[PDB]
Design a protein around this ligand. Sequence first.
Ligand SMILES: OC[C@H]1O[C@@H](O[C@@H]2[C@@H](O)[C@H](O[C@@H]3[C@@H](O)[C@H](O[C@@H]4[C@@H](O)[C@@H](O)O[C@H](CO)[C@H]4O)O[C@H](CO)[C@H]3O)O[C@H](CO)[C@H]2O)[C@H](O)[C@@H](O)[C@@H]1O
Ligand SMILES: [Ca+2]
Length: 231
Amino acid sequence: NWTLVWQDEFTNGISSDWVFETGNGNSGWGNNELQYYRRENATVENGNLVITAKRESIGGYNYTSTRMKTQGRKSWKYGKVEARIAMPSFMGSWPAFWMLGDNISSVGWPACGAIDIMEHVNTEAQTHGTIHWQDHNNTYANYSGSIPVSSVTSYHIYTIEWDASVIKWFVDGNLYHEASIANGVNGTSEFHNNFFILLNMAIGGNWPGFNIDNNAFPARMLVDYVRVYQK
Ligand SMILES: OC[C@H]1O[C@@H](O[C@@H]2[C@@H](O)[C@H](O[C@@H]3[C@@H](O)[C@H](O[C@@H]4[C@@H](O)[C@@H](O)O[C@H](CO)[C@H]4O)O[C@H](CO)[C@H]3O)O[C@H](CO)[C@H]2O)[C@H](O)[C@@H](O)[C@@H]1O
Ligand SMILES: [Ca+2]
């Protein structure tokens, strides 16, 4: 059976296991994103994390939002990782629930690996699950699947199950994507390391594009909980 090993239910504020990013990072967090991250864009309302993206000017940027992470506090090798999320749907939006290898501080991205548990862009009627890594030839690799979601603005449950064989992705318990990491096949060795969790909402960038609905602000992403189970 699955054993619960960590959670944030956001019932009494935001856990001290989260650290917040500030600013636009290096070339828009590597994706030419337009937002400046802050602590102030994260609040709790009635047992939910609220990440609010705003049209707000600071440090030469015209949008603000939150990127938070458990890096340096909590990380896991294998498990079931899930969040119950309701996210906005508007041109320019790019919310994510994802994971990075603990060793990013030494080896960088994408050698560290990334598991995107949920991404959404713009007004798409689907959500994406992806791994990113450096394959056996040291070439940047990604492997993505998607599932139709007619209402991303409603709460859905976004899950991975991760073991030494496979990562499986689910929305509302519906399996839609799977990736073998057995024996480090296709150079997937770095998914046999500890990973930490991130939550964010980016505004613009290479994938969603730079057509921003300025009339969609402020915009809210609500997270009822994040949980990690292991065997
Ligand atoms: O040298 C070859 C090319 O390098 C390019 O610069 C790299 C930069 O893009 C890269 O930025 C990544 C960023 O893309 C990545 O985005 C995340 C996604 O991959 C996915 O996991 O989803 C999350 C959530 O939506 C998303 O943020 O995030 C990582 C971690 O923040 C970030 O590092 O970083 C590398 C390593 O530094 C840069 O080399 C450059 O722009 C190209 O011109 C060049 O061809
Ligand atoms: Ca909650």
